[PDB]
Every structure is written in structure tokens, then in C-alpha cells.
Design an enzyme around this catalytic site. Structure first.
Site, PDB file in Angstrom:
ATOM      1  CB  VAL A  12      -0.800   0.484   1.138  1.00  0.00           C
ATOM      2  CG1 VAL A  12      -1.614   1.573   1.416  1.00  0.00           C
ATOM      3  CG2 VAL A  12      -2.183  -1.280   1.501  1.00  0.00           C
ATOM      4  CB  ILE A  34       4.783   0.875   4.162  1.00  0.00           C
ATOM      5  CG1 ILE A  34       4.031   0.526   5.989  1.00  0.00           C
ATOM      6  CG2 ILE A  34       4.501   2.656   3.495  1.00  0.00           C
ATOM      7  CD1 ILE A  34       2.807   1.220   6.018  1.00  0.00           C
ATOM      8  CE  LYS A  35       3.827  -1.303  -4.751  1.00  0.00           C
ATOM      9  NZ  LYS A  35       3.551  -1.622  -6.415  1.00  0.00           N
ATOM     10  CB  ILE A  36       8.896   3.547   0.677  1.00  0.00           C
ATOM     11  CG1 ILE A  36       8.768   4.919   1.258  1.00  0.00           C
ATOM     12  CG2 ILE A  36       9.421   2.362   0.165  1.00  0.00           C
ATOM     13  CD1 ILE A  36       9.704   4.492   2.277  1.00  0.00           C
ATOM     14  CB  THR A  38       7.904   0.971  -5.383  1.00  0.00           C
ATOM     15  OG1 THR A  38       6.851  -0.155  -4.389  1.00  0.00           O
ATOM     16  CG2 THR A  38       7.479   0.819  -6.947  1.00  0.00           C
TER      17      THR A  38
END
Lengths: 222, 221, 217, 218, 221, 219, 219, 218, 218
Positions: free
Chosen positions: A60, A88-90, A113
Site C-alpha cells: 500500500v 508500506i510501498k515507498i 518501488t
């Protein structure tokens, strides 16, 4: 080897889990948008949908405007609270990495990412990210070849015994899934239709028809 | 896999440690010079900065004029006393090697530098050097290709089970870091800017902008 | 095989021409800036410096803000008038290409720059550009490998008999020049110091010293 | 792992041991001749110089005129008595091999030399020789390529788990040492000067000068 | 090397011709459908649009239900009359091939489509087809690799000096165009957006911004 | 480049010529047998069928019992008289070769068959045979690989500028045809069904059906 | 591509010429010995056998004891007089080469033999020898690999456009002939039996039997 | 690792064992014929020669006329009784294989011979043959290449962990032995002269002469 | 390593088991048809034939008309009851896979067939199928090359440690068996005649004749 669904459409996610044994889910602001629903509603629906399920990551992505680790960590922690399935997509930026470094120190799993080279992939692994997501599709759209850089990442990770798991991303067909399997990538993430069609082949249809004819010329109930 | 900073600027070293988790530091007389500060002051600042840290090497190169093992060992021992983080950088010369042989026998860690071929790399390993530093950049500047000789060194070290760790040196970009990672080099040493930019990619910028637009068209609360 | 100087410092260009037999010159807004001089002054100095020579291209990049072919062509034509040695450097964008297409139709030589893939390189060739400039350095800084895509471009150009000449760009050392020579690139463009050092080698120094001793005996 | 000195000059051997950590020594009728001193004197000097040092082989070649296994074994035993550091260098001939077979049965270490192909290398290993010495230089002088046959030997030895150690021999430069290291040869044997120069490189000199200037400005 | 547009949208075709110098056009029943217009209207608009231009092929596919060469040839001849730019797209079936054989004997250019292997590609060439169209995309969707079979076709055609031109088809990105260029395919056919994006790259954007900053710090006029 | 039909069934040969533009025909005692007709009748039907056609070789194999060149040449000459399209198929044996050498000297085209290695292929070329026929299928049935030896033959022929044309033989599928095309073999010879199916592919069927649906929603 | 017979048995040479179209002959002191006849008798029989034939080399090796160019040239010239088919086989030694250099200057064709490396092969070409003969068999007997050095020689000769023709020598089977053909060697020289067997293959026998059965079931 | 002698000449076998440490013996009807002696006499001489010796296989081929497994097994069992060193050589035919399957079930070691492809090699391994013997020479005589098929067999055997040992057969020179060693074949079988020559090399002779001169200058 | 017979002819299966040590059996509606017998009779004969045998899979394909997992699972369970040797052959379709997923969850072994690419092969493995059957022949008939995709599947399976066993299918000759062995495929399935001929080679015949002559002269 792990198949993740790159979608924010709950019905797609439900079918995939039940029938394809998907091993997790990836999202990003674009997929959130195209869900039609608001962010915290999507998240809530997910939280409830997978309250039970124990080892099933849902990636997300925090607000992409953020330009500083402090804020990044704040906003992501909020999201983490919402469900223990969430990762946690960062983005792979200077603050992005610093934030991930902290998140992981604090035992919050991250997914770095917007990785496009092996040097970009290295640092996430060096900070003990749970996931790195290198991209194929966008590079290919501009005429860049991807097969070497993906292979390189995998070999590098294996060679230096990093735990970080590779999610090959921005995939658009079955051949590409296979490329990643051949490379030994840990994980792959694809749209619903990609996976669906990766299971179907014209020779199967052709085969069925051969066999239907044969069955129709057999005594099938003595 | 280990990232070392090839710099003498303490502020660069501080940032790197805190944010990049650099695993150590390399210096050489050129970087010392361009610090502005005198040698023993740089060293002092380092000693204090890392008094605490236990497994964090700082490679510090003895005077390049020295031309004899006896003197080399004397001057290096002096430097070693100043901190247990320090490793003694030493040129790959006939005296250089003899000195390293002795230093290591006496349990003082060395870093043999100015290595340009696998045959040069072999002897440091044969003497039980803690570090060898083969060079890429200077060779490439003159039109020599380096990828084979680096790979060869790594394969050789692995094949004969030497403990000596390889520090690929004189790097100038991310691609080169990757080359070394692919080769399986133990360590890489790069300037601040090299590492910084090795993390940045135009497609990331492009991606952020895509995503910012998408977020701005989503109800986020 | 052609060596071009990627500089806007006239003194560098003078030395190169006289001693290295440089075959031409490349510039861009960054090099113009770091000249210290204003654009049209740099251009003027160049015009005069090479008034005589007819076979010596000087690539000069139009304003990068321009976002439309019409304006691009206008501003570039102005620059072309200033000297027949000048070639119009133009970014590989949708308008950029359209502009180049027109420039070349009108017999004005162009150099399509900021090319980073073979697909990007193809269209300039398809539009009959005089030069295409694929980049190495910036890609490598971010961890991308370049050797394949450069080789691919050369093979593609040779295979389909395009006359567009490849200028491998953003080079930083001799090895990279050699990579391009091995690939068969038409042209390479490098800073002054790159070329200078590409001629110098530690074994030469070592050799001279051996030989000085021998002579003195 | 494993640099041997191909010399008979004791001063070269002394320096090498003390400073290069050479792991042993190879000799040969040609090197013994060019020492100036007579065979049993060279051997005696060696015996004294080392004997007491534990695992440091000195390969010493029996008279090349001998043409019968019986005599070979006799003369070699004599040499073996003189020091337990000595290994008996023996040509890869029909009698040579028979002799080595016996020497090793009797627990006397041998070094089969004048090996030029993998088939020649195989038999020494099959008879449990302690060392085999395949040659590079002489082949190359006549235009033959060596890199494959050396690699082949190593792969073969590893593949069939023979204990015999390979000494790549008749080497003349650093590149060739590296070739052998890449191949995975157990041992390499080179002249004093070869090793000395294998440690030196023009870029180091160039580097020192850069660095001397930098030091002089601090 | 030739770029053809795989579209039936006239506005796409107009822009492409004027700005990209596309060398021709491919269609099929699916693209015809998604035009919104009826078949003979699309064809008519094309006929008029390119009445003048010589050597600009427009590939137009006959009814796929047809199961016999006789009918195939009849219906295709009708279409050929409509414009001398038109090429008759025909499936790689037993009747399909027989029909193409005849069409070409009668000097009517054909494009054999739905080719998925080199053996399928051979017969069109053996019958003197003007175009063969081997497919990439659909195969890849099902997990098949295509790069060998395309390369094989090109090498085969070159090796036996066939004039038939290869149109690599069902393409979806720039990398794939490059694959074909590397292979030496005569022609490639792609949707509007594929070509558009094959010209754009994040590093270009990055470059422009570097240069805009530099310009903004230069006295130009 | 050239497709020959390995059959003796006239109806197969007719269809192939008319629709596939087959460039010629190969036969052997097995195919003759399975025709159902007698040898000289098959030959006669062929003679008449292609009286006109000028560049269309028909390979016809002499009695395999023969063990001497003299007889071989006699029997083959008889067959050659029957039609100028006929080529004399001959085994790669010591007498076989000697006979071919003579046949070609006398301007009678030969096809040396039962070739299984490049060394076997060389001698036919050295005696100026019009055709050599190296075999794939039978070798593969016993577990031998063929791809190298075929490639070798082609490279050898090209390299030493021999005129002899290679007919890759005992083929059983499309992939194998392609292998030969990739190798650069001059000619390939296959059964009717092999060629037929080498033109058909499941993705084509799939494609047609996609397109039929699209058509049914147009016009 | 040329096949030479490495034999001194005239009956072998006769058969080969008549049936195999051999393109020439090689000999050496060992083959001369095993002829049973003396040297000058063998030579005489050859001279007469091929008095007519114009383009058919016969390589005949001078006494190997000779250790000086002047004598070498004398003895070889004597042999050359005996027939214009003869080529003078000469060892690749310091005197050997000097002699060949002179022989060729005087327009007398030579064949430099006992070549075992490409560096050895180069000098004959540099002195304009008509033939060089690199050896395979003896090297392989001692465990040396030959395939590279032969390929190297061919590539080198082609690359620098030397006229000298390569005779791959000491061959013992068909595979080796093929290796040379693949390499692009100009010439190969083999014993009678080698060539004979290089034309036979077990699958041909197998094929004949299949076909004999089929014929026996055909009218 | 294993050198077997492909001969039926007892004197050749004696010398090989004593001096070359040959690890076993292969025979066939052709070698038996060229011995000069009759079959059961050759066998008897062998039985006695190796009554003592424990791990030394001697491959002996049953009558090649046999066309049925029943008879094959009968005749081979007879031969097996004569000595426990004997292994039963058997052609790779439909009956041949069936017979071997049975022989091995009954604990009698077999050697399946006249193998020319990997598919032929597979079935012997699948029936637990002690030895399979793939052929090189006869194929090469007809222009076929062998290196791939041999490598394939070895890789296949290693990959599927079969115990069956590969005997590369119909060998004629040293290079070919090396090919097999490189491939990793378990065993090689060669004539006396092949092995003898595989140990000798012109460079050794050349080397000796260099060294004799050097020795003569004490 | 494992040879399965792709036939429904009991006599073929009997001979194969007794003489070739086949490790199992594959069938499909076409083979059932060409047996001449009715389906449930074939199945019954099999059940009885191998009542005893414990580790011997027999792959039996459910009605191909079925277009939903529910029905697929019903009909297959019926077949499974008939014998514990039976494995349920199932097409690689969307329902096919869903059904296999369920079958295996319920401990009923499946064989996913009509697989033509590695992406198709992946999902069966991901759902824990006991067997996947990728096809060679039909692809080659249309001019597609298969060697890569088969190798890819094997490498993928090994690399991600899936237990699913690969049955290379639609094979037509020995070379193809070898290709699969080289690739490392677990299993291969071939017609009777394919295997029979994969054991026969013209050089064997040639060898026998040489040897018969030699035998007749002692």
C-alpha cells in the site's frame, strides 16, 4: 515461487485468492484511483477481508508528494496500524530509502518501488527491506531491454545472501512471468487478466476438440 | 556486501553512516590533501568520531615517499596506535609487500593498494592481508578494460579460499558498482556523489509524477 | 572514425583541431553556460574561427524550453544563418523529431540528442537526421548498462543502410571510446581531458625511463 | 595457495622463503648446471638450509641418462636418504612411471616431470604420485597452445578426486601464473625474476608519483 | 526499415503519415470493428485519403468466415478494385494459401497473416506473397517465447533470397520493435501509442530539465 | 527453398503440384510398394502426368539387390529412357557411388540416398551427383542427433562450391523443415501430411475465431 | 576439395584414381619401405603410370638423413627430373625450409611435412611452398588435441591470402576428414582403408535390407 | 579413474596389471579369435590367473548367434560359474536387455555392449547393469561425431544417480581417452599399444636430451 | 529416469512392465478409443492387472466436454475409487486447474495435461499437482521449437523446489527422449514402438555380424 496480484479491485483479489492461490497483493496510487473507491475505504475493505489470513502481504503506497523521511514514517505508521497484512510501498528516493531504513528498524515491513537498475535495488537490500519491486514494462515502452538487469539483481541478492524478496513489476504477459521464473525472482506481480491468460493456450483448445471427438467415438459407460 | 566511502570529508562520512549504513571508510594522500586539514588532525577527528564502533575499518595510507620496509613498519605502527579502527593502506611494491607481511604477522591489519593485475593481487592474499584494493578507473582512463581482471581476482580468491577481502577501487558510477556485485567482490569503495546517484534514476522521477497526479484525483480521506 | 570535442571552450577547441585533428565539435546549454560567455557571442567566435572550413560540424542546441516544432524551426534557422558549419542540436521529443524532419527536408543538418534507447534512435534515422547522439554516462550514473543498446543502434543503422551518423555521447574515459570503436559507432564526442588521457598510459612512462637509461649507456 | 621457486641458487631460495613465503622448491639438471656447484654439494647445502622445516618440498631430479626402472629406484633412494624434504623428480617415460609407482608404494614422494599432455598427466595420478609437473613454456616456444591442456588436467584431477598436486612449470611471466590460478592448478613454479616482476606494475609507479605529490602538499 | 500503423482510425493514420513518415498501414476485422464505422466506409475513406500516393500499402482483411479459395479470390478482387494501395490480408490456412497463390499470379498483392511459426511463414514466401505477418503478442500472452522463431524467419528469407517482406505483428512496446530491428525484419506494425512512446524516454525529460536550468543561467540574447 | 514430395501416391502428387507448388518428387521401394500399383505402372503414370513439365525431378530408386556398378548402370539407364524427369536414386555404397560417377559422366542425373554422415555426403559431391539425400528420421529413432551433421554437410558444400543439391530426408514434422531451412539445405522432402500440417497452427484457428466474432459485430 | 591417397601401393593408387577420383598422392619413407620395392623403382613405376596426367601431384620425400640445404636441393632436383608430377616432400627444419625456399624460387614445387603447429606452418607459406602438411594422428596418439591448431592454420592462410595449400595428414578415420572439411582445409590425405570406410555407414546397410524386403513385395 | 585393457592376450594383461595398475579387462569374440587359443581355454587361463584377486572385472562376451533371452541366460550363467571375476558382455538388443535384466536380478554382473546412442545407454542403466560400453571408433570410421553422445550419457547417468559404470570403448589414441576423462566417464578400455603410447610424448624425448647435455656439464 | 507408456493396449503394457521395467502408464480419450475396448472395461482390466503393485501410476483422462470444476471433481472421484493406481488426467484450463487444486487438497493425485508453455506449467505446480504433462509433438508438427520451453520448465521446477513431476509427452523418437534426459525431466511418456526402437541401432546389427564371423572362426 509467489504470484501477487497488482490490482486494487477487491472482486479480482477475492477470485484470485480462492482459485489461483495468490500469495499476496500489490497496489499503487494509480490502482487505488482506478478502484473508484477512496483510499481509506479500499484499505478498510482489505483489513476486514483478510483479518484472519496470516502470511499474506498487501502493499500500500504512501502519499507520493512527501519529500522527507520524518513525514513518510509518520503517514506509513498510520497505515500500518490499520492492518498487520499491510506493507508500506515507498519510492526509491534519498528520503524514501532513509524512511524504509527506519521503518524496518522499527519492525514495519516496507516495499521499495520505482526501482529501475541493480544499483537502485542494492540499497533496499542493504537496509533490510522486506520487498524490492524492480520494473519491466515502463522501460520496455521506451525501448530499453530489462532481462539482464533483472537477472543481475537476482544473482546479486543470492550471491550476498540478502533476505529481501524481489517483486518483478509492471508485467504485461505470460512470457515475462516465465523470464522472471527463469531468472529466479522470488515474486512476480501481475494484473488479473495477465495471470488468467498465462494459463490459456490455443493448443489446449485444439487438444480438447481432438479429445472430444475421440470420446464421442468411445463407449464411455460399458 | 560492503559499501565503503572513499572520502576524507567528515560531514560526508557522518551522513553516509547515519543514512546509507556504509560499512567503513577508505582514504589516500590525495583525499587527505583535499580535506584542507593536516594528516594527524584528520586521524584524530576520526579516532574520536568512531571511538565506540567496533567493526568499522578506516583505511589510512602511510607516506608515499617511504622506500623501505623497516621505515614503512615504523610509521604505520605509529598510525595504528592512534585507533583500533585504522587499517594501514600500503602500496603494492616489493617493500610494500614485505612490510604488509610483517604488519599482519604482528596482528596489524593492512590494505594493499595500487593493485592493477591479478598477479599483483595474489601476493597480498598469500601474505594474509586483511584487504586488497584493485583499481578500475585509472586503467579505463588510458583505454584498458578491467572487467576480466577484477572477475579473475574474485574467482581466484574464492577458489583458493583466501580470507583477504577485495575492495574494488577508483569507481566513478553505479554501473561499475553493479559490475563488481555481479563479480562477487567483497567490498566496493566510492565517492559520496557516486553512491548518492547510484540510488537515483530518471524513471523514479517519472513514476512519482504519474503517481502524484493519480493521488490528486483520489479521495485520500 | 571521427573524434568530436564536447566543449564550448574555444581554447580547448583550438588546441584539439591543431594537434588532435578533431573532426568537429558538440555543444549544449550546459557547456554554453560553463563557457562564461553569452550564447550568441560563443556562436559568433565559432563562426569566425571556422569561416574557411566547410567540412567541420559544430553542434549547437536550440532553447530547450521550446515545446512546438514551428518555433523550434524558426529559432534554429536563425542559428543556421550564422554559419554553415553549424548543426542544430534538438531533443528527442515528439516536437523535436517533427522539427528535425522539417529542418532536413529544408536541407538544414540536425543532431538529435537526448537519445537513450535504440527505438529512440530509430526515428531520427527514419527522418534522415545527419546526426543522432545516444548517451552513455547519465544512464551509467543510475546503474543502467549501455553496451548492448549502443551496439544495437550501430547494427540497426548498418543493417538498414541509414546514412545518419551515430555520436556516442556523455563519455568519461578511454575504455568507453574503445567500446564504441569496437561497436563501430561512426563518431564519438568527449571532453578535452578524456581524449588527452586516452593517449597516455603508465607503461609508456615506464618504457621511456627504461629507454632513457639505455640511451645514456 | 602454492608458489614454488624453479631455481638452484640458494640465495634466491633464502630470500624467497623469508619474504615471499614460497611453499617449496623445484630443481632440474639445467638449473643445477647453471648453479656452478656440483649436484651432491647443491643437495647438501639444501639439506642443511632446511631439514627441520616440516612440509617444504625440494624437487631434485635423478640422472636423465638412466634408462631402466631398477637403476632409477636405486639412485633415487640414495638421494631420498639425504633429506626427507627432498622429492624425487622423474621423467614421464615408461621406466620413469614404473619407478615412480614403486617409489610411492615404498612411501617415497615423487614428482613426475616432462609431462606435456593430459594423458601423460593421468598415469602419475593413477600411480599415486605426490606431484605432477606439466610444462607450458617449451610447447609455446614451438607454437603450441597450452591453456586447454592445463585446464583439462585440473578438471580431470578434481573430477576423479586424485590427491596428486599439479605444478604448472616452465612459466615466464605473471599472466601465465594467473592463467593457472584461473584454471585452479594446485601449484605453480617460476624463476625468481618472474615472481618479483609479477608483483610490480607500471600503474603502481604512476600511482606513487601522484600520491607523493599529494603528501608533499599536506 | 519500415514502420506500418496497425490501426483503422483515420485520425491516427493522418497524424502518423504527416509527422512520423509511416510507410504503410495494416488493418484486421478487430480494428475495423473498433473504428466504429462500417467496413466499406473505412475502405472508401482510405481510398480517397491516399488516392495520389504510390508505394503506400494498406492491408485489408477479407471475411474470415470464407472457407474456400474460389470465394476468397472473388471477394478480395472486389476490394482490390477499390484502390491500388490495398493489399489483401489472408489467414494462413490451406484455402488461404491457395487463394494467395492465385492472387499473386494475377498480380494482386497479398499479406498472409495469422502466422505463428517459420514453417507457416515459408509457404507464403514459396507462393510469392508480397507480405507475411508473423505474430508476437498472442504467443507471449500464453507463455511462448517468440524471439527465435522471428529471427529464424528473417534468416530463412535472407538465406533463400525471397522477396516476401516480413511484418512483425501484435507488438506492444519499443523493446519489441528493437528486437525486430536487431533480427533484420523488413517491417514492423504497431498501434499509434506504441510508436509515440517508443520515441519518449524518462532520461530525455531529465535531460531537458538539466538544460532548462542551464539556459536560465545563461545570457542568450 | 525447394519442397519435394516423398510419396508415390499420384493423387497426393497432383494436389501438391497444383496447390503447394512442390518443386519435385522423391520415391523409394517402400513408397512404391505402398502405392499398391506395380513399379513400371507407377513410372508410366508419372511419365505421362509430367510429359510437359521441364524443371520437375522425380527420384526413382533402382533395385536394391544389385551389388555391382555395371548392372546398376544398365537398369537405371532403362528407367531414364522412360522419362527425362526421372532421376536415378542410388544407395551410398561402393558400387552405388561408382555407378553414379558413370551415370553423371553419361549425363544421367542421380540422387545418392541412404547417406547418414558428412563423409558419406562428400563423395557424391566429389563425383558430381545432382542430388544427395541425407537422412534424419531413422537416426533419431535410435537416439542419434542429426542437427550438426546436416549443418556440417551444408557448410561443407557451400564452402567448397559443390553444385550437388542436398535433399534432407526422412522428415516427420514442420520443426524439422525449419531446422533444414535454418541450416540452408537446398531441398527438403516430406510426406503429404507433414507439409499439410506444417501450414496449420492452433493460434491461427484461435485467431480466426477472434476475428469471426469481430466481423459479426461489424459492417 | 581434394582427396589425396597416403600410400605407396600402386594397386591402391590405381583403384583410387579410377573409382574415387583421388586428386593426387602422398608418400613418405615409411610407406616407401612398406611397398617392398626400392625408392627409385617406386618412383619409376609412378612416373610411367602417370606420364600422361597433367594436374596430379605425387609427393615424394627426400632422404631424411640429409642435414644441409645444398645437398637437399641437389637430391630433390634429381627426383624432380624423373617426372613433372612429382612434388618434393621436405621436413620442417631450419635446412628443410631454406631448401624449400630455393626449390620454389627455382619453380620446383615442394611439400613441407612434419608440421605440428601454426608457427611451423607459417614459414612454408611465407616462402611460397606449394603444399604444407600439418599432422593430426601422431599428436593425438600422445594425448595432444589438434582441432584448434588445424583450424588456426586454415584461418591464418585464408586471412593473409597465401597460395600454399594445406594437406591435413596422418588421418585415421572419416570423422577426421569431416573435421578438416569443416575447417576448410584445401586437401586431406588418407590411407586406402580410411577413405573406403568413410563411404560406408551401418544405417545404409540397415536401409538396404528394409528396401530389399519392400521390393520383394512389389510387382 | 579406471583403465581397462581391451585385449585377450594374457601376456598383455599380465604386464598391464603389474606395471600400469589396470583396473580390469574387456574382451569380445574378435579379441578371443585373435588370441589364437580356443574360447574355453582363454577363459580357463584367466580363471586361474586371477583366482586370488578380489576386485578385478573381466568382461567375456556370450555367443553372438543367440537370439533369445532364455539361451543367453543359460550360456552366461555357465561362464559366470567359471570365475567370480567374469562379467557377462551382452549386445544391446531386445533379448540382450531382457537377459541382462534377469542376470542382474540373479546378482550376476553384466556389461551391455554395442551401445551407440544415449537412448541405447539408458535402458541398461534402468535395468541396473553393472557396466554399459558405448562405442567411439566404429562411428568415427563412418564419419559420425561421438563427443556429444558420450558427454550426454555421462551427464544423464550423473543426473539421475544411476550406479551403472560407463566404459568408453573402441578407442584408438590418447586424445580420445582425455575426451572421456573430460566428460567424466567412469571407465575407459583400450588396446595395449594405445595406453603405452598415451604415456609417451616427443617433448619428453626432447626434454631428456636437453637435460642429458646439462648433466654432462657437472 | 522414469519411463511411462503412452498406450491403452493392455498387451503392450504387460510386455513393457515385464521386460522394460516401465514405471507407469499414461492414457487419453484418443488412446482409449484406439484400444477397441470400452472405457470402463479398459479401466477394470487395469485395476485388476495392477491390484498388487504399489508405486505405479496410471493416468486416466476425465470426459473432455466437462466445463466446470464441480462436475470435473465428481467424475474424477468416481474414477479414483476404481483403483489407487489411477491418476486423474485433467486439461490445463481455468476449470481444469481449479478442479486439480481441489482434487489434490482432497489427496487425489492429478496429471495436468495439454500444457504447451512454462506459464501453463507453473500453475499446476503452484497448486501441488502430482504430475504435469508438457507436449512436444503437436507443437513441432506446426513448426514450433520445443527444446527451450521444456528446459525452462525443468529449470523452473528445480529452482523453486516444486515436487510436481514433469512428464514430457507426445514424443515420437529416441532423440527426443534423450533431449528430455539432458534437460533433466523427471518422466517421459512414449508409445510402445518408440521405446522399442530407441533400444535398436544399426551399428549394433553391424557389430553382431562382425562378431558372428569372428566366433565362427574359433
Amino acid at each position: 515461487m509467489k504470484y501477487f496480484l497488482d490490482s486494487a479491485i477487491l472482486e479480482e483479489i477475492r477470485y484470485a485468492y480462492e482459485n489461483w492461490a495468490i500469495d499476496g497483493v500489490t497496489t499503487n496510487p494509480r490502482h487505488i484511483m482506478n478502484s473508484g473507491k477512496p483510499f481509506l475505504t479500499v484499505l478498510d475493505e482489505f483489513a476486514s477481508e483478510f483479518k484472519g489470513v496470516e502470511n499474506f502481504p498487501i502493499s500500500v503506497e504512501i502519499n507520493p508528494h512527501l519529500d522527507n523521511a520524518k513525514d513518510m514514517v509518520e503517514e506509513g505508521t498510520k497505515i500500518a496500524k490499520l492492518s498487520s497484512n499491510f506493507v508500506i510501498k515507498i519510492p526509491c528516493t534519498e528520503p524514501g530509502l532513509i524512511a524504509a531504513k527506519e521503518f524496518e528498524k522499527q519492525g514495519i515491513s516496507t516495499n521499495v518501488t520505482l526501482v529501475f537498475s541493480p544499483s537502485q535495488a542494492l540499497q533496499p537490500a542493504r537496509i533490510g527491506a522486506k520487498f524490492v519491486s524492480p520494473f519491466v514494462g515502463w522501460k520496455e515502452n521506451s525501448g530499453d531491454d530489462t532481462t539482464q538487469y533483472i537477472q543481475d539483481i537476482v544473482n546479486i541478492y543470492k550471491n550476498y545472501n540478502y533476505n529481501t524478496e524481489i517483486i518483478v513489476a509492471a508485467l504485461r504477459n505470460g512470457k515475462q512471468i516465465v523470464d522472471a521464473a527463469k531468472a529466479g525472482a522470488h515474486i512476480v506481480t501481475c494484473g488479473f487478466d495477465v495471470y488468467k491468460e498465462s494459463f490459456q493456450h490455443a493448443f489446449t483448445d485444439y487438444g480438447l476438440n481432438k479429445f472430444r471427438n475421440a470420446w464421442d467415438n468411445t463407449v464411455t459407460e460399458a
